[model samples]
Target: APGASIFRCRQCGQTISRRDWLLPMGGDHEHVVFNPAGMIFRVWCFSLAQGLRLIGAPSGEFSWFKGYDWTIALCGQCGSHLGWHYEGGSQPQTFFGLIKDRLAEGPAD
Candidate 1:
């Protein structure tokens, strides 16, 4: 197994986690989200095997997809739009789906 370390924000180097690193639950996935100006953008998805902590607040507006509500999460370190937290759906599951490009991997083995 790969060793785990802290994950940081690519933009500011703020520590996102000092615990386990992010893991891919399944495979590659993507999502679409809208901006305040009604502009839309796509975000790449990655699932976690367990829970982790992040700094950010949910958007005032709810983003719906496949019956789930998503809230855009921002980086507390740099205030950059990191990704989203998905919840409130027909299924009983919740997880964070972050943009692949926004996160910086910790030290490699």
Candidate 2:
């Protein structure tokens, strides 16, 4: 990977993805999503996040994205909750919605 930018887990310091893998969603690559529980998350959707761990079954209920189902995504190294793995949408076949603050954009332990 010769890319100049890298994103990693802020907690365990593991590689999550790269800048080039970032994909446009909701008319933009970056989005500010507000949860039903009043939690606002700034997420960057990526086409691939090879360094992250995906868990749980796809749940279409309460999905923020219309046709997509979401599953829990965790840190590849330390299993920290990082985001959700999205799938089965007419828009994107597979992708990751990583929390902006949970990721350390390089320069981490």
Candidate 3:
């Protein structure tokens, strides 16, 4: 089957052609912004292990990690808290975290 197509980032307006969003692990505020359509931007929500594997990470290194973390939304062109990252931790992580309980909804309303 054909793989999913690539799209551009709406926040930084960068291209999200690569997978895993590129991170050194153990870092917060890491996210992959995607451009779904004209003026429509969406985030992958969670880091992808397979996406990281393609980057040359050894197998099982990225294991135990969620694949899709509930895609959030925001203005690719402009920076906005379209959705939450859902760290799913005890304490809040960021501004989004503080409001996660209140806005802990799906990608779209």
For each candidate, the alpha-carbon lDDT, in order, equals: 0.56, 0.84, 0.29
RMSD of every prediction: 5.2, 2.8, 15.2
- Give the clashing residue pairs of candidate 3, or none: 10-76, 73-82
Candidate closer to the true structure by TM-score (higher is better), 2 or 3: 2
Off by over 4 Å in 1: 1-6, 17-65, 90-92
**lDDT winner between candidates 2 and 3:** 2
Best-to-worst TM-score order: 2, 1, 3
Candidate 3 lDDT, 20-109, residue by residue in tens? 332222354343433334332222333321111011212322222233122233433444343433333332321121112111221211
TM-score of every model? 0.54, 0.87, 0.21
Instruction: Give me the candidate number with maximum lDDT.
Output: 2
Q: Ten residues in a row with the worst lDDT in model 3?
A: 48-57
Worst 10 residues of 2 by lDDT: 100-109
Each prediction's total of clashing residue pairs, residues at least 3 apart in sequence or on different chains, is 0, 0, 2
